[PDB]
């Protein structure tokens, strides 16, 4: 598996369509500061289902859609399509090439597609999670990860090792169970208080 092509239209600073054809080895993305090269990273995060606004360097609809410039009026639609080579069947999809598409409209509506078939965000997230490319994978690394490693608080550094260990789903289930316990006890407490005012 590898990235074949990133098509971007109306996303952040890419007012007209761009199309990055990656090579199998090392593709470098370069250019003057502020001229948009890190919007390539944001577009890859976004189409793969990132919803953290912090992770996206702006993840709200007005941040995503080209907002206008001296050169051009704002657009009402942003679209990204990532095409992946699936020759080795790394992704659990019976297709030689897998395309993931994300759109957001100024009106706030969003569309998600896999191989041009409408789906939910969860289907994109689950597709990459099931193949070992979910939230904890180190398939996208920005300077924030270096900062976490270099942090003075030991919890920040441990977090990197917990991602590598794939503990998030266990941690989440543990917290879900602890919250169930708390809310069950809290509901009982509130019932007993209502009942006590009836006495």
């Amino acid at each position: 598996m590898f990235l074949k092509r990133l098509d971007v239209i109306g996303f952040k600073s890419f007012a007209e369509r761009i199309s990055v054809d990656f090579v199998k080895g090392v593709t470098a993305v370069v250019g003057p500061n502020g001229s948009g090269k890190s919007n390539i990273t944001d577009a890859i995060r976004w189409v793969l289902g990132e919803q953290s606004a912090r992770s996206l360097r702006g993840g709200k609809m007005e941040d995503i859609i080209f907002a206008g410039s001296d050169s051009r009026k704002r657009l009402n639609l942003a679209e990204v399509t990532l095409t992946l080579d699936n020759d080795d069947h790394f992704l659990p999809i019976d297709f030689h090439e897998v395309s993931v598409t994300r759109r957001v409209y100024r009106s706030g509506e969003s569309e998600f597609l896999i191989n041009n078939q409408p789906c939910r965000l969860k289907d994109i997230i689950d597709l990459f999670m099931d193949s070992g490319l979910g939230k904890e994978a180190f398939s996208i690394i920005s300077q924030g990860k270096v900062e976490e490693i270099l942090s003075s608080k030991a919890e920040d550094r441990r977090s990197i090792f917990e991602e590598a260990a794939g503990v998030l789903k266990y941690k989440t289930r543990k917290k879900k169970a602890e919250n169930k316990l708390f809310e069950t006890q809290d509901n009982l407490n509130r019932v007993e208080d209502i009942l006590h005012e009836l006495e």
């Binding site: 600073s13 390539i40 410039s69 001296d70």
Partner: peptide, 12 residues
């Protein structure tokens, strides 16, 4: 190498 630059103002 892919070069990303704003030839027109605000458009990469």
């Amino acid at each position: 190498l892919y070069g990303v630059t704003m030839q027109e103002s605000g458009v990469s």
